[PDB]
Symmetry: C2
Subunit: 507 residues, 2 copies
Amino acid sequence: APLPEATSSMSLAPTVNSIDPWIFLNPTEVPGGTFTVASNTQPGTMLLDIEISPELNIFTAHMFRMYAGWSGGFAIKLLVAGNAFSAGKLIVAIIPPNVQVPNSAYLLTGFPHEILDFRTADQVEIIAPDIKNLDYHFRGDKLGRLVVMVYSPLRSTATDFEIEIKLLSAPLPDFKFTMLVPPVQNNALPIWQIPPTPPGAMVNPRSPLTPVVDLYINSSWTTCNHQLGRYTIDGGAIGNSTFNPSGLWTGTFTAESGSVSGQTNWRIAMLDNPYNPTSDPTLPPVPRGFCDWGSGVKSGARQHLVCFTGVETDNGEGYKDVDAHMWDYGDDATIGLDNTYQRQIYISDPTALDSGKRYIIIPMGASGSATDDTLQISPNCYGSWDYAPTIAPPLGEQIVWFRSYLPASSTSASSGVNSVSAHISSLMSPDLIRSAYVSGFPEGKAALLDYVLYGGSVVEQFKMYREGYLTANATGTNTGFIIPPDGYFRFNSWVSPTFVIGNVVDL
Amino acid sequence: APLPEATSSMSLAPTVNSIDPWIFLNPTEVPGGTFTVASNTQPGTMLLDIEISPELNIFTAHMFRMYAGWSGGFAIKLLVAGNAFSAGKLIVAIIPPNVQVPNSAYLLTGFPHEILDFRTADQVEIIAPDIKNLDYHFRGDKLGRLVVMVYSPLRSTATDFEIEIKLLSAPLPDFKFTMLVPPVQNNALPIWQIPPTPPGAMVNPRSPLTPVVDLYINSSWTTCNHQLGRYTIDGGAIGNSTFNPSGLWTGTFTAESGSVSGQTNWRIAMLDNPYNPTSDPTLPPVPRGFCDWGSGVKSGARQHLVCFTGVETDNGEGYKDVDAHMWDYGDDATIGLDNTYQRQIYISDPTALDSGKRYIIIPMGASGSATDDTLQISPNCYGSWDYAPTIAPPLGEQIVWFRSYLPASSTSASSGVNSVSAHISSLMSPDLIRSAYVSGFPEGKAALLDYVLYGGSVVEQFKMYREGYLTANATGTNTGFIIPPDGYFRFNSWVSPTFVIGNVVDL
């Protein structure tokens, strides 16, 4: 116990409550309180920054949804799962509120601290008190976090094996709830119910009309710059993504009676944005949910084909004469507009284009000599509208990409088209992420979940972060390992973002 | 009151547990315990047959997820909300387990009973004891049901309005739980969290690529015969529907090198169903998720088009010459195939087709004199495979139809297509019913929910059944009523399947 506890009289808190006496005796595991230390962790790194609250125990985190006030501290105990060769030192400190958490062991030592080495080979325990200046906290600024750091690295003498540390907790004899008036449904939960929906029955946000066939992981793609399928728990649909990919796939554009220099057949046109009529820089330029496939930096050689496009029927009741055509962003000449994700596009057609008449487009397919690597990169966007930033996983981890097979739609005609089959991948399907809104993630925590195959004979483990991407550790270098979709995700636990997956990919 | 309860010393249950002391004092509402009485109820009908269990108080329903055993009775109160003109009497009794309950109010006054008038405007109460014979219940048979009936009919014709009856429950001071060991997630939930997504941002199961435009209620469509978009709470996706309509919208078939008698341009063809390789009678004939729009009993003028169709490149690497064409089921001659929703189809094209050659079709649109009325009906289903049954709303109610607008895609050629713009309706979008799987419906109960428009200045009320179709009362006849899709569904309560909604819709 590095710091004394408060009495928590609760004199002026009406209708104080008494909880089950058996909870104080049977300690459970803290939800977000497991982590690991490896041989290559940087000294002075923050492994755990959980805060004192009623969410440090399975029972009081589920019972807390009925009340609106609490006051009391916890008594936690460390399970180390140590070794016989390693040697290092940990550090645990209590941080009072209204205090910028120090990000250096030098400064962290100036706090109620206790230093534990790895050669203790036992299970110590520490008391976490609640620093309150009020009679009892309701649900607000519940600081008093429990930062845990690495004072000295573990240079193991022999095998460089890892250490997994977890925490068990139990309320102090002075922990009480107050004012059970709020019935239900206020805050987070200790569990997450993932329905057993196979990925083979999920929609692909970046390419509808094509079912997901496999899960694809590739070593060369170490970053993502997509603008469709970007979902976050905190922000919902972020960037230009939406929750109905199928509904918003078809688009409409208007001609402008012109052509770019060099090639006259590239009729210029402008896209229509009902959401942002005026070209205000603070809103997305293109209509929401429209394609963002990449085609190259600047090369007329290949050009994704718009496939089905149609002319106005002069009646206002639809369109006419759907034909297979090819399109592209920008002009393939200007460096500042070749790949910018903007309104102006060009469509290749030998015949003249109806000026001032709108057309319907259903983009599906790519033409030229384009490969999956060309399509994987997305045209970068510049401007003022809040767009999805580029994402890179931590070192030693990959990304699961929900790849799907895109057939070819060519023609034998005068102009022709060299469209070829390919594969298109998306960051995360909306079906999986949509479920985790009833019971949101605990703050600054990732979810460790399992993917089982056959009758459970082979189980892989994935870690899902806050922004919605899954890592799967590494086994070696390959052209992209393929996982069948004949399985269901199963929730396993909550882990820190720095957790290292135990099970490896196994080829 | 008329029957004492048992003490239940509970010697054989280890670790008996205590609950909050303020729960016994504040009575909450029993979840599935509201109903209505009118002047047209058939005599001798059970208006309520609820079962004694900890699921009568939202607080003990939330508490019970942590324990494994319960023991104790409740104290129930009735709210009648009558008038000063209604004249009749109700009756509520308690039935011990394993006893044949009669269906007459004359014999029903032998059990411990209570008789309350309709115009009381008070809070009558009855103590419901636990008629247990074992040490303590353990998620097993509890019966002790709480049947409610009508003693003397309300003989009045001047008023003719509905009476709404609700119950409030509170645990007796001897209620207690045992064995807190089970952490969480054991049984159902009493509350439903519906995410605030307007129907305009939902996928239409019967017609993807077209967003929902309005909510449609028509006074002439009194039945549903669809096979797509039909879901149930317990049965998941019933019929030939699926939770990913966009991924299964594209279809394929093979030509048979033939023509129907009379018309030469009608090439006979057969759809391939990978999910049913053999012609097993107990499996659906057509592939899952394929189109099922109706066309007419027998008509060679109202034929809906297949729109995009194409042939493979003779290499299995793509498709070629995808153009707009027309199709239909069967042969328009035989009584067993004219509209029977089976593998064989016929496609209209002047040139004959090469046998054993694969073709791809993406159906969208209807040509000829086909209207929305013809599209609403579906081809009949024959055989022994499990198909979705017919649905008819209870008398005095209509159905909300999730209507979307299907444009026309014509062409100017020698043959051409005369397609017109139409509308397509589906019973239930998958997104709305996806939420109600984590917290399923209670036994034999429907859900009453609110549809809020603008900022809450206008609210409608809908009732959702376990079969997946919404009903919205009625006032009179109309040829198509439109509700804007710019609003979100909000859960209100649980009601009996014969509950009469409050608000009227005025045509």
